Design a binder for this molecule. Structure first.
Ligand SMILES: O=c1[nH]cnc2cc3nc(NCc4cccs4)[nH]c3cc12
Ligand SMILES: O=c1[nH]cnc2cc3nc(NCc4cccs4)[nH]c3cc12
Ligand SMILES: [Zn+2]
Ligand SMILES: [Zn+2]
Lengths: 368, 368
């Protein structure tokens, strides 16, 4: 039987790593991309389809779920896995990020955040994630807005570290959760090296199963994000997974792996898929464009997904233009599959010591 | 290799029949329910899922398709079957019914109907259905509104019979179509027995592969519809399929089979599914109802569909309330599967000479 949590690194190249996270509900191949489940569903996909794309784990947003059906109700119904029909690992977010993003009349304090649906404390967040039956639980933090002054970034980071300790204690106080789930801490500090160091030190002292880099992908742009990752990731414990929250575009993922990131999530493949954007190895295309109206080729010429085996650009163009549900289904399946194929190529190239070459080849073609 | 068209009756009970239609693209078990494909998709379902429910044939609406992408474009892309990924038979409607329903500034004449997208003649309709690559082609007719005076019903029916002859000639003039597809005529005459007789006589004189009962399910109600079917269906050639257009609710289907109907279509399982209505053997339920919020039972206790094997009422309730695409997917798959299971029970009971008993048992439970 698999352990609660075991991260093993099988191969390395520079700062990049490939390996596995073993958990009770399954094995996660790293670097990993986690499709996002909002409101207990990866939009427009049955869980079996999500698995068919290659996903080992999904991210469950807790924000909508804690509102409806409610964490308690989901617990009564047997937990999130049973509820939505996904039996593999689920990483849940804390709910606090989207509270700041989607709620109104929010009021912050040292205790937590109070909000009106469109009080969430570290303790309540951990409890909600428990009630959902989360496999990987995120500490409740505060994502510092960008740009931030050094003073405000420091104050925000310091609060987040206090909340990280509270998250740790709440998690540990619940026997069933502590024995069956894992807990990740989140590094803050904006773009400031000294604050990032203090945050990493605080998190490592508390001790977590994995470490996220927070406070990025919030408007700073790729150059600045990469610059911050350059010094921030080496501050985290090497022997634990590194999770870059909310990232991202294919090129962002490749660059982040080059800098030591092991885990990713974003709504981009799902959300932009329903909007008409399809990822290809020659860069993204918008299937709504009239140039695809009679194009019999698949979305991507090399993609192994079921959509590219069966349907043409012309048909998917028609579906998206017509507002048909099947359009969203096909675009989303392809995009998630593309992301998983990207992760597989990344893992294989690191394992073979040719990831640097892959990154170069990928960029040359993707941006040709 | 299968013939262009062969209808064989394997068993009978009263006016009810069960058998098969053999065509080049596949065999159709009768009595048959045809899921409706609007804009080249059965809403929220991949074709493989439509087939998995038990469907042998789908109905392709031509109205939206002749507007976008256009019949000519679909022909250039290889035809409707290739376009949407359904390789089994497709019955196409003439496009005229929805022109009267969905278009504005329509102008009728003996030549056909002129309309503004939100001239369609018998010849153009048959050509469009050819360009789509239809297996069963519907004659272009006029659905007389209800109620209709005897004079207006007569004039409308007479025009429809003239259009039926024009449809026949257009179909026969095109070698590829005449050799590979079938053509159905449509009986009109409103609720009037003498006009129904004249219409049946006219259609039989022209000669068709199958005969539809038109002009019903247009507001008359079940009692009146059944009364008209009582005298109308026996007027049609016994050795050819009988198709009741636009029907319908499960009880309507059962009663229509009792009166000699072999083929059905309606948007009810697809459309009402997305709205929240789920069919069960104990009658329809609306999954949005709060009473289902914590109900762990499947949509129906006996249903063999994949949805009822995997997901609870509680989950589907949540999805539909949240406006999630997966909600529409699951509801539609179940409803279409329910309809196919109904047709299977009908076919089996006729084959076993116990259909009368089945109809009684069905109604007693469905309306309990
Ligand atoms: O520090 C963080 N803490 C907890 N959750 C996060 C989620 C995050 N998502 C993004 N970027 C993606 C976006 C989602 C919505 C606006 S930007 N950056 C993120 C940072 C954090
Ligand atoms: O005589 C007909 N001719 C050609 N198409 C039809 C389609 C039909 N669909 C219904 N009823 C279902 C409805 C669809 C829209 C409003 S009622 N009745 C129908 C009658 C006809
Ligand atoms: Zn693909
Ligand atoms: Zn079912």
């Amino acid at each position: 039987d698999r352990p609660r949590f075991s991260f093993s690194i099988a191969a390395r190249e520079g700062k990049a790593r490939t390996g596995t996270i073993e958990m009770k509900r399954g094995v996660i191949r790293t670097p990993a991309f986690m499709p996002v489940g909002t409101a207990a569903t990866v939009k427009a996909l049955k869980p079996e389809t999500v698995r068919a794309t290659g996903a080992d784990i999904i991210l469950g947003n807790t924000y909508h779920l804690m509102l409806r059906p409610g964490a308690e109700r989901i617990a009564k119904l047997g937990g999130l896995h049973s509820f939505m029909g996904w039996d593999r690992p689920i990483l849940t977010d804390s709910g606090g990020y989207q509270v700041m993003s989607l709620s109104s009349l929010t009021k912050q304090s040292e205790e937590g955040v109070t909000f009106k649906s469109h009080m969430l404390s570290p303790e309540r967040s951990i409890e909600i994630q428990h009630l959902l039956g989360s496999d990987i639980v995120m500490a409740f933090d505060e994502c510092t807005p960008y740009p931030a002054t050094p003073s405000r970034a420091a104050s925000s980071m310091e609060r987040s570290m206090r909340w990280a300790k509270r998250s740790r204690d709440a998690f540990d106080s619940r026997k069933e959760q502590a024995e069956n789930a894992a807990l990740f801490g989140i590094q803050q500090g904006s773009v400031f090296e000294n604050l990032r160091q203090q945050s990493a030190d605080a998190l490592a002292e508390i001790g977590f199963d994995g470490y996220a880099v927070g406070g990025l992908a919030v408007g700073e742009g790729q150059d600045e994000m990469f610059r911050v990752l350059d010094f921030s990731v080496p501050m985290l414990p090497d022997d634990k997974p590194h999770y870059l929250m909310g990232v991202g575009k294919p090129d962002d993922i490749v660059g982040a792996v080059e800098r030591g990131i092991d885990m990713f999530d974003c709504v981009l493949p799902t959300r932009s898929g329903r909007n008409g954007q399809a990822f290809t190895w020659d860069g993204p295309i918008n299937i709504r464009n009239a140039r695809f109206s009679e194009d019999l080729k698949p979305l991507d010429s090399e993609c192994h997904c079921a959509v590219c085996q069966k349907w043409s650009r012309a048909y998917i163009h028609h579906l998206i233009r017509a507002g048909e549900i099947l359009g969203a289904m096909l675009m989303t399946e392809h995009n998630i599959a593309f992301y998983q194929q990207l992760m597989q190529k990344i893992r294989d190239s690191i394992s073979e010591g040719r990831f640097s070459q892959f990154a170069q080849d990928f960029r040359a073609r993707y941006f040709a």
